[PDB]
Symmetry: C3
Subunit: 179 residues, 3 copies
């Protein structure tokens, strides 16, 4: 029956993504004073991060991870003689839910130009058991990065979030994603 096969094939996808061959994804949304939105997305195996400068106008930031991330591994960096190299910010991430299922994890914060870097490791319990180290080194080379700008959030939502089934939270706290 075409109802039963569809259901098991969803359970296979979950097991694949939660294996160490599943990707970890991160998005960084920079909300600008003219109402436009810049989004940087990176996807990779084993671990993933973004490091960028948001120059001129940016007013707030939202960082979204795929559900494969281990929230406790998330780290973020933002006088040189007296500063810590990162903060562990996982406790500030909110679950994005769709039909009861976690589709992502969101950290939104307002800015008082900023340089920002964020990093997270795949959930799999084998992650801190370094598969060979050289496989992780190759994953750093194979990571794909995407960057584009949208005129307003409505346009980002209808032509970037919705058509690609990405997880998201908009200004009205409406949540997006596919369970």
């Amino acid at each position: 029956f075409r109802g039963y096969i569809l259901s098991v094939q969803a359970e296979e996808q979950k097991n694949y993504n939660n294996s160490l061959n599943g990707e970890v994804s991160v998005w960084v949304y920079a909300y600008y004073s003219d109402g436009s939105v810049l989004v940087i997305n990176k996807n990779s195996q084993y671990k993933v991060g973004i490091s960028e400068t948001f120059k001129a106008k940016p007013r707030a930031i939202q960082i979204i991870f795929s559900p494969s991330v281990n929230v406790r591994t998330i780290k973020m960096a933002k006088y040189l003689q007296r500063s810590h190299p990162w903060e562990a910010t996982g406790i500030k991430y909110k679950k994005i839910k769709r039909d009861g299922e976690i589709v992502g994890y969101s950290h939104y914060f307002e800015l008082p130009s900023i340089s920002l870097a964020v990093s997270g490791v795949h959930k799999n319990p084998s992650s801190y058991n370094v598969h060979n180290v050289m496989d992780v080194f190759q994953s750093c080379d194979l990571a794909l990065r995407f960057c584009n700008r949208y005129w307003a959030e409505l346009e980002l939502v209808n032509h970037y979030i919705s058509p690609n089934a990405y997880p998201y939270l908009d200004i009205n706290n409406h949540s997006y994603g596919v369970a």
Copy 2:
């Protein structure tokens, strides 16, 4: 005799390049609809990769590795919930030969803008025996990248491929390189 010394000095160079202090090199050629060619070259120790977006016009791609690469380690990446993090494409690479000697390895494919990443590890049998891991981390910092554009393939061949002794295959399937 100046004939004998020249020959042994070639055997020393082979042994050096096939040691773990030899570089791995990669080139990515993007062939555009106006007949121009964009080339990105990266050279590094232990392993090497490229990750770029080719935006506007690009019609085909050729990826060339130096003979120090282990062809079986080559990996290439090109809905998020349902995609594999890379394909192992080494079996698609063709040997480039000059006077009977492998001067490079070539994967050419036509496109139906693309984002693309490719990665390969040095041939040396010690590669999967991680020298210290910190030496490999430094190699990631020391990798040098070069990018330029040429008006036509003839110009790339005469002012980039030939003067630098690089391996290549042109549109007429003529092979270049120095044995």
Copy 3:
């Protein structure tokens, strides 16, 4: 007494920076033929590097590391079949001193456009004891990079070096930094 607490708090800062949670910093200064200066700064944990091309006019280079670097780990890269992947240049670095204390390490050299990469590892004796390898991989993602251009060295010194307490050596061999 407010004199005693200030002194011990300096000894704590030294111990922190010389721990593996202290940052390693690197600056690359490119001196151009119009008297302007381009500076690239990167800061990170465990290790740090820069890899850039300085295109059009550049006439000399100065590379400055924070005192947390292990000078013997410094490496620099600048026909493909016959070149070494880096040189260990630590012996060319000069100590920058302020009130008897090392505030940095400087390698200045004149050029005869250049592509250049430099890499150094934190001093801590535990550095070659890979904390988990995945922590070092995350440090690569969290590294922050800064780049700007100044009209003349006097402006770089008064609006970049002095206000940020960075170590430096100017054209008159005057040294800057905070002990």
